[PDB]
Amino acid sequence: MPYVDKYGTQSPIQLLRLILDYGSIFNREQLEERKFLQDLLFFGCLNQKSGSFTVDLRLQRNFSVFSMYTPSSDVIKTIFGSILNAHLSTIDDKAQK
Amino acid sequence: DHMYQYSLESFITFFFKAINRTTVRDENRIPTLILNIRQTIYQWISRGLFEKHKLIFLTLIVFRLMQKKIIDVAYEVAEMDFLIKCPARPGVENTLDWLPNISWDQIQGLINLEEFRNFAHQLEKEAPNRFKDWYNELQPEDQKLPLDWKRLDSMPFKKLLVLRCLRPDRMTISLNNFIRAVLPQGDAFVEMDQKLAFSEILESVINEDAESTIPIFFILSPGSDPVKEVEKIAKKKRIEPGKNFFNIALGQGQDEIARRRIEEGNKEGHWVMLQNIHLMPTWLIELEKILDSYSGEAGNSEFRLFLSAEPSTGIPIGILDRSIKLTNEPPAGLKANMKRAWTYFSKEEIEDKDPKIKSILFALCFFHSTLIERRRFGPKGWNMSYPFNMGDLRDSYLVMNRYMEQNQGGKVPFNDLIYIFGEIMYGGHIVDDWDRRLCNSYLFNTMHEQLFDELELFPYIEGKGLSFKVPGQNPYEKYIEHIETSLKQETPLAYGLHPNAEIGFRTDQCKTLFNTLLELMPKEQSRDIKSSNEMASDLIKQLLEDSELKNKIFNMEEIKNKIDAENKGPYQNVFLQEIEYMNALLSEIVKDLEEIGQGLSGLLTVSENMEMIIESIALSRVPASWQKLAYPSKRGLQSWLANLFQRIEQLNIFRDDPYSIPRVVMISRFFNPQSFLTAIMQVISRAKAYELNKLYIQTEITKRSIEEIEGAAKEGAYVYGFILEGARWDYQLGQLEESKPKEMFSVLPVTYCKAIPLPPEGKEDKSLYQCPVYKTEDRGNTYVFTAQLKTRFPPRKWILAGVAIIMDVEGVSD
Amino acid sequence: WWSKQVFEFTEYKETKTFASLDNMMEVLDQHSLDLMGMKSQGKYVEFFYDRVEDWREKLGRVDVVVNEWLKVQKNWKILYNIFLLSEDIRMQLPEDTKVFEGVDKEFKDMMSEVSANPSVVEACTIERRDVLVGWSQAIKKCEKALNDYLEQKKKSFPRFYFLSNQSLLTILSNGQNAPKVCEYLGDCFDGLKTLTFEPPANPAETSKVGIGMISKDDEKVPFSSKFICEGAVEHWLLNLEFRMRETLQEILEGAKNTADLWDSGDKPREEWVEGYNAQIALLTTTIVWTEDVGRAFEDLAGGSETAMKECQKLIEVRLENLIKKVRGDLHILERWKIINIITIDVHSRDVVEKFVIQKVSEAESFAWLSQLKFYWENKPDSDMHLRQTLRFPWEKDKNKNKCIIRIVDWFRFYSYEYIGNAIRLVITPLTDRCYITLTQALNLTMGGAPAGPAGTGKTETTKDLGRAIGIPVMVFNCSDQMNKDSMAQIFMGLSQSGAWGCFDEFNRISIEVLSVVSTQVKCVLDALKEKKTKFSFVEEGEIQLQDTVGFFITMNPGYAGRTELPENLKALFRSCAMVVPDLALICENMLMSEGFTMARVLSRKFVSLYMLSRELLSKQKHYDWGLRAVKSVLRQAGKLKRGDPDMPEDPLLMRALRDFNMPKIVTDDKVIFRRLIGDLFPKLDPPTKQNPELKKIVQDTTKKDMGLVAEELFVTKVVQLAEILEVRHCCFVIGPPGSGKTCVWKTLIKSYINSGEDAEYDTLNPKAVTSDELFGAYTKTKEWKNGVIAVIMKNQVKNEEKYKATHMHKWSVLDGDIDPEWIESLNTVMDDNKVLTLVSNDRIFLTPQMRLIFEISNLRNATPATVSRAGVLFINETDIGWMPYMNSWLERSQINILKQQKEMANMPEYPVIDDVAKSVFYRCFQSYFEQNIDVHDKNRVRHICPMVDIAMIQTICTILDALLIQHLPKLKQMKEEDEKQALEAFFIFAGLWAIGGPVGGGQDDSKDMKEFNTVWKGAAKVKFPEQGLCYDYYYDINENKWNTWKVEDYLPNDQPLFSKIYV
């Protein structure tokens, strides 16, 4: 969702790639200082059909991809069914069904 | 077109003037006033318009009177939309021999109209007895059809429509005859202001209108001076020695002098002529503000401002509006152009010069003259528009003049002089180099040893019967008199073009007058029940969705998997590259279609480019984004789709047995033809044992038709869909010959393409003629390769005729 | 701020000055802006306006006085500097010099008094402002008087008009100091940059005695005798302008006498060329060429057929003999002194070839009259006094041979200007035709205009024509800032001194100022037709006219914002048609430059390859088929030619073209391109050349310290990169999104370390950081901060870890997506010239041992020009593969090395892989990717984002890692049979999930899962229970039953927020 330029490549994303591989980030104050970064982990959360459709394939390679699937009858009924059953039982012994 | 902007205020003064000119005293004032207004406004605008546009504007006025129904005419609203733009409809392969295939496709648009629904079947019945006979007959618009079509020939509009569709060339002439019948006192509108010439118009227009506050605007073409005509007229009206009135020419620094002169002019009352107004674009914005201040003040009576300028962009709209516009165009003709060439050269210089030098100068004047007449023809002619001035002819004389003064008694070198005329004098204009060879033909034919003896300037003239020769040694005054008599009538044949090449011009002329008239045609009939642009786009979309476009797209991976890639060929490489381009086109047009189709029937934002595509479909022009993809060949939208599916058909036969090349290939239906030719040479280079660079492709025309099953002939590649323009290739003779008069384009038979090493040295053969092939009829930087073919006539004849090969002419069967 | 603000005086030796006023000035302007508006607008402010308005007036007063010194000090500085150190110019205009000196002393005093006062505006008051305005007006008068004096000097010397007024002023000021004047003659003339000088009698004095002249390239022409600088600057410079010509003329008489002698003489041609100068040598070549051809025509009138064939044969032997001389090591000045001759003798050979083919046996045929002929003859019936005007003594002598230049009825003397070995353009049938048009225009005393597209370099052809003639050529560029007055000065100056005027981008001129140019030009052209020695211009009538002057204007039809020329002007200038120079004729020269005997035949073959290659190969942005790429391929081939001259040319060229294009070319195009090459040289068999020392050390370093498998395809790419770095300073390591592009350059450095010495590399991402901040820009405060690129350039030279002391090869790595805005700042470094441009204008020069490596996925944002500038290298994803990672992971050598030698102390320990376990994993990886087409099939498996093959392998490995550590103790306790099942199971589970995550998108996610469930369900010997997804099951070591994921029954919580509640 960070703003994409004319060239179709995002400045904030490209920085993260420099951190993942080389492990050195140049601080805008004292640009001579390497400022090496260590024991850092990054956990992505990407929404498709939102801002940029796809991010850079060279970053996406360093990340292990995972997908949340769209809601299902079996998935919804187990999630919400357990919330309501716990609250409706406190209301009345009836109206659980 | 720019600078045709007219003010509301100026129109209102002309409109009122027309009312005051009416002398009728309420007997038939209301009728005669309307008639007088039309005349008054038309003549004002016509002066403002160029010769070519004057016709276009008269067609509007009558169609707009017809649209609103101010005069009673027999027409249909659907039929007027069909008249302005005719869509070529494919489907029927069966035609008549004499009728062109393009004319038949226009008739399939005529069939969709209810009045000419039964016309298609009537046409088939006694076609050769009646329609062939009528088609063949000249001035067909006056000739009545013998198949009980007298009823269509009574009604002048309905007749006019049929005449276009059958014969495009006679439309421009027939229209004038139609205009005269429908419009009241129309015979006076056709004559217009041709009887009065120019000098009489300018004397009249100053006195009758633009007395004060309305400055007069002149638009001059090259070789025309407005100041010479106005000064003569200026002297008769009032005493003009050059003191009272000043003919101030606009230069840099002289803007303050012109400002002082115009300021002085208003309070004094003397008129002021300004020249070269276009030369200072900053001062026109300043001048505009001065004119607006003086219109509010209202300095002295009988004051005018004349302004003369070359037509250009970035002229202020405000000035062009308020000012009356008057255009002066020199008489357009070979003879009229030759005459203007001799008038330019000073009488007293030519008399001094001896008979030899003045004789060769004459032949040069002609050479300069003929180039301007070729410029009028698009593809068949030059292939490109190049500027030619009198200064470029003068330049060439001054060099020639020196060469005669040095040689003296010793014979003059033509060989030295001709190179200069082709490579320098008229080389400077031509960059393309294909036009240069044509340019040298005219030159080579005009300049030779026998020129000084009486010799035909027009090429060959074997059985033409013009008999126009260079004048023998005589006094200067006798040269012009002979020029005027011997040129008499101006024809295409004079330049070296074929008669059918003139018909083709009236076609190209006719077509432009309707493409302009479509834009000009206002309010789209003002509703009422003709199908909207978005409906017409939806209908074409439905036809494309009915076809399996998504199926027609070829997955690259499937085709690559079928090929082993060890036994792969150069042919196979070209197709793979070609089908990729097609996939990229076919995916793009389906994307643009399914997007615009969704935008019509679904609530979604409509992009600017998508509105343009909808507009382009209604007009039935190929879209700009689509045109950019694939081939650069211009066609109709319905023709393009039919042509595209024939391209797709050529790739479908490739997908099944790719390794086995088809016996007959069609170069007319490729993305790059050149790419294919490089391929056929590559296959030969493997089989043979020499460099590919050394091998040149050499076409040889074959008498066999497509029927022959013989394919993949060793040192060979078959081709078809080549079409020859400006000539006919006879099968029986086995040679190029002069074209049939009525047949515009001559389709070539099965072409055999052999690769063979180049000659060690540059060798010129009289029998072999080098004709360029072009992808499109336009022939503008679409050169692919030089084909060779055997001709009994000299090559010089054919390069002068302009004869070339075209891939797509819209004369392709089925 | 203002009540206490100030202006420190900075001494200018000796005037206190207001420097840094602008910083105060801007603050004062800001105070005036808001303060004046607020008082009038504010209702509360309106009540106390009697205060803001008085303060606002004071703020307004300050600005006028502040602008006033700036308008006076700068202009006073300039006029004062004209008076300063110019007794010559002081005595010339006494009335103004004295008035000015009066004003300067007053100004120096007033400024000192101000440095005593507080606010300048408060000190300025009104009376002071009026006094300052009067002083400024008085100074202006001095400038006007000085300007009139400059015009008189401009009339005296033609070169001064071309020279900038700031330079002109400097020269007039330093009229005594000769060496400073000679510095600015490089701007006036085509060559003659400076003059050599005899060391003077007293060391304080600068030398006057000129022994020789120095070119722009440092070629020395010695003068016959000592040239003394006389008094007046214009007077000794005009004597120098003539002494240049005199000396060129004096040597040519000796050159032509020795020219006849070398032919028959034992001394070779190539050795004679060395002795003389680049200009005189080239002329004397062309002179003895025309004599030679003239002797061949006279023989063929006799009847000897061989006369034309022998002249052909001779010209073709000298061309070959000279071609060997360029191949053997020479001096860079001597290169072009010899290569410019190669470019004229190739044309000469093409002329005589063309004469033999057309069979032209008569002299005074057009074909001979057409060619640019040079004649060295004392014509006893000299028509040259009629054709042009006699200017120099030798032209008027008529006892000594003069040099004449004949071409199509236009004969004009070789004017002897000094060009100093600038490169002659390649002669082509278009340029021959172009020379005809321009010469005929001059013959008719009117202008000659060549019109063509951008990149034609028409201006360069018109210059090179005047260079062959030896007339000076001046180049003017018009940015639509040209005025009537500024233009008139150029035309006035051009007419005074015989000089060809070529206008660059003449098309983009204001139609107003153009209509003057047409009147000015017309008045000159009208004078040339009359041929008058003196003519009368519109203003400053009395000017010396010279017939030799000619005006050339270069229009571009396609250029945007084109203004149509007036019909009157169009008639004056003869239009010529200009086309892009043929790639065969340029390539032919470049091949003859490197010393190929068969160059001609190869050139026609070479061009044909490249032209065919563009059409048949798929359109790639990284492919460069331009002339700039061709030269960089030839230069590499040329070093290899010089190495092995005895080897034939066709087999050598073959090997070179294949080698350098292979890396850039993709695998699809590699097969066709190899077969395409076969067309050109079918008989010739190419042998692949690889350096064994470089290949061995790369293989050894990669096993020892990189812990990666030295694959035959991988090592070839590293060797190919190493070659590219040697030839090309700047290189692009382009490739696909997921490969080992980074590993390839990293492996090369560690190989250079083992090879020679340690090689520091400074990695950054340019795209990531802002374009301005990377290169570095000025802040609000007037202070420049060092950019990230800019500091590495300072740091790498000295005073850092990357310092050039002990390191043989250093290079800065960049791994961002190339952009036209970002590269534009670096486009100076991209070019062959090793110059760095910054906003500060600090000059940094790239060392020969410094290299640049760019690493990009897509070259789409990059411009086609940018691709040409540097040497490209494409790495095919399939050629590297993912196997080398997997092999490095199973061996753990890669992983082991990273832990040993990194600052990453907190790194997780990877499990120990059993020899039995390794052999199962190796077989399983290989068996599941190669055999299954269904896994890699786009149709079968639908990904959300386009995951690269390498990326999915990296996830399998990291999942497998954690699964081994957890169950390591259990795998040892178990038997090898159930362990072999368990390790396969672990892989399947890990594999499933490593490709599971990426699966999604479409209309229904469930449909894409079921398709993926089906194909993966066939996971060799191991099976999944029915009526369950592969995801839902995980492998249990103890059970061995693939037990489905157990979920914990949700427990109610008292959390108010619903987003906090997690089921």
Ligand SMILES: Nc1ncnc2c1ncn2[C@@H]1O[C@H](COP(=O)(O)OP(=O)(O)OP(=O)(O)O)[C@@H](O)[C@H]1O
């Ligand atoms: N011979 C080899 N065998 C196996 N793995 C290798 C080998 N050489 C390199 N690798 C690994 O392959 C990956 C290549 O990383 P690299 O950054 O070079 O990829 P890239 O796609 O070119 O990156 P970028 O998109 O940032 O330019 C790394 O994990 C590297 O260690």
Ligand SMILES: [Mg+2]
């Ligand atoms: Mg990387």
